[PDB]
From a paper:
Botulinum neurotoxins (BoNT) are a group of clostridial toxins that cause the potentially fatal neuroparalytic disease botulism. For BoNT/A, the HC/A binds to both a ganglioside (e.g., GD1a) and synaptic vesicle protein 2 (SV2C) at the nerve terminals of the neuromuscular junction.
The structure of HC/A2 was determined to a resolution of 1.63 Å by molecular replacement. It has an N-terminal β-jelly roll fold and a C-terminal β-trefoil that is consistent with other HC/A subtypes. The quality of the electron density map is good throughout except for a small loop region (Arg 1269-Phe 1277). This loop (which is conserved across all BoNT/A subtypes) precedes the ganglioside binding site (GBS) and appears to be disordered for other HC/A subtypes. However, it was not possible to determine the identity of the bridging atom; crystallographically, both were equally possible. Further, a recent report based on a systematic study on the presence of Lys-Cys bridges in protein structures revealed that oxygen is the most likely bridging atom; therefore, we modelled this atom in the final deposited coordinates. Although the biological relevance of this Lys 1236-O-Cys 1280 bridge in the present HC/A2 structure is currently unknown, it is interesting to note that both these equivalent residues are conserved in all subtypes of BoNT/A, and that they are situated in a dynamic region of the protein close to the GBS.
Residue numbers in the entry: 876 to 1165, 1168 to 1227, 1230 to 1267, 1277 to 1295
Write the structure that this text describes.
């Protein structure tokens, strides 16, 4: 039922739908080199994507149901200038009728307007005053459904967030043009990233929404914290979802030492704007290829884990012959790893997005178990354990300008 479906192909954005919308791209639109479907719009007049729909499919009805889906990534709002500044990002208003998506500090907004200037708005609000956010500077799946007899609904990552009655709106006559552009944003530093914009000529149901989410999410490729492809040879700060206010540290190099979780994390703060845990804390992990893998970490890939201590790499490993169910993990000199267990199988696991698991194996093909932690009196030591289902879920956090913390 897709009447517009925008994808990157052959050095261009095209409509895959049978309606072949014309797409005009301004000279200040940018693409991620790792994934050209990830479009970046910045706060300049020529950072524009203009989609011209065929007359045939322009929305002009009291009764026709319709839906939109897209993924968005919204950098953290840093300053008072971002408060109280609703800005359009996707505009389909003509002569004060149609629809639009807009943003504000902590908000995604859907606006419907009929030809008598009755309006209805549905809103997703997310806080920047949280230790760890599912939303800030992370890919979010947005779905908005419109049943002209009942309600407008906004879904985030397949979950219903807000719904409002719209049966009081009359004829909505939207534009033949969809303008992707930051419109009315007073912060010249603002940008968004967007991908997989779709229009549908029905009210999508919860099952169709979940299937779209799961499909476009692509559980075959692991994700970093921000929702980008997880990569080999890229340093990552580590987050244990069960103990999110702790960071990984090393208690000495070698088999007689251990890795462990230490807390609390620091805070990054601008009064009244954000108050978050520091993400750039603790010993970084680097994922190493075990094989003929390409640059992206895929579900069930076999890897080594390198740990960075004072700008030197060591190997995550254990002696699985150590008595006990929990096998305490150490940072080994790479030349000394010998016969220690070190091969890891990376697994995707997609509530909170971007969860990864790591399954340790010995050199004889035996599972030692998922990597998590175990409390030994006051110290949360990293372990591999067949006991693993809480404490064995991890996120990998690279430095990102959309998060803005100091290195």
């Amino acid at each position: 039922t897709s009447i517009l479906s925008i994808v990157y192909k052959k050095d261009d954005l095209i409509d895959l739908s049978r309606y072949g919308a014309k797409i005009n791209i301004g000279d200040r639109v940018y693409y991620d080199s790792i994934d050209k479907n990830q479009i970046k719009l910045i706060n300049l007049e020529s950072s524009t994507i203009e989609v011209i729909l065929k007359n045939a499919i322009v929305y002009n009805s009291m009764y026709e149901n319709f839906s939109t889906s897209f993924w968005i990534k919204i950098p953290k709002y840093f300053s008072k200038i971002n408060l109280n500044n609703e800005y359009t990002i996707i505009n389909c208003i003509e002569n004060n009728s149609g629809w639009k998506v807009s943003l504000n500090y902590g908000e995604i907004i859907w606006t419907l307007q009929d030809n008598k200037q009755n309006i209805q708005r549905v809103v997703f609000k997310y806080s920047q005053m949280v230790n760890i956010s599912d939303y800030i500077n992370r890919w979010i799946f947005v779905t908005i459904t419109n049943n002209r007899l009942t309600k407008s609904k906004i879904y985030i990552n397949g979950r219903l967030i807000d719904q409002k009655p719209i049966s009081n709106l009359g004829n909505i006559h939207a534009s033949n043009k969809i303008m992707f552009k930051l419109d009315g944003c007073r912060d010249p530093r603002r940008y968004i990233m967007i991908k997989y914009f779709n229009l549908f000529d029905k009210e999508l149901n919860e099952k169709e929404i979940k299937d779209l989410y799961d499909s476009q999410s692509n559980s075959g490729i692991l994700k970093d914290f921000w929702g980008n492809y997880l990569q080999y040879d890229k340093p990552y700060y580590m987050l244990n979802l069960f103990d999110p206010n702790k960071y990984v540290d090393v208690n000495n190099i070698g088999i007689r030492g251990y890795m462990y979780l230490k807390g609390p994390r620091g805070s990054v703060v601008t009064t009244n704007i954000y108050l978050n845990s520091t993400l750039y804390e603790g010993t970084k992990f680097i994922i190493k290829k075990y094989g003929n893998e390409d640059n992206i970490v895929r579900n069930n890939d076999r890897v080594y884990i390198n740990v960075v201590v004072k700008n030197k790499e060591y190997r995550l490993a254990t002696n699985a012959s150590q008595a006990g169910v929990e096998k305490i993990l150490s940072a080994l000199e790479i030349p000394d790893v010998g016969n220690l267990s070190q091969v890891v199988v990376m697994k995707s696991k997609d509530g909170i997005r971007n969860k990864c698991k790591m399954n340790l194996q010995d050199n004889n093909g035996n599972d030692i178990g998922f990597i998590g932690f175990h409390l030994y009196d006051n110290i949360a030591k990293l372990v591999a354990s067949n006991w693993y289902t809480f404490g064995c879920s991890w996120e990998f956090i690279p430095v990102d300008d959309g998060w803005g913390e100091s290195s």
